[PDB]
Structure 1
């Protein structure tokens, strides 16, 4: 039904089994950069990975 709310990405999800662990479920990782390549390179890498 929330696709009838066309201006906002209204994304509803269920909590996990226990709530102490995380608010989402599945996996999680951070794309980071030790070389100091900036922020545009890192965001381009994030959207490339997506």
Structure 2
């Protein structure tokens, strides 16, 4: 994470959790859903706002 800070790629390195069967990353995760039928770009700009 110090040597990989180079130009071309946005390389991200990490370690799996201790039980690989349960997920692949520690911490929280959530979904943002479109209920009213609004388009994709509105949900994209909402994700950027979040």
TM range (shorter): 0.7 to 0.9
Q: How far is the alpha carbon of 1:17 from its aligned partner?
A: 1.4
TM-score (norm 1): 0.85
- Taking structure 2 as the reference length, the TM-score comes to 0.85
Q: Is the 8 A contact 1:15 1:24 kept in 2?
A: yes
Q: Deviations over 1:4-33 (max 9, x none)?
A: 431111000111111001111111100011
* Local SS of the residue matching 1:2: coil
For structure 1, which runs of at least 5 residues remain unmatched after alignment? none
- Structure 1 runs of 4+ with >6 Å offset: none
Alignment RMSD (CA, Å):
1.3
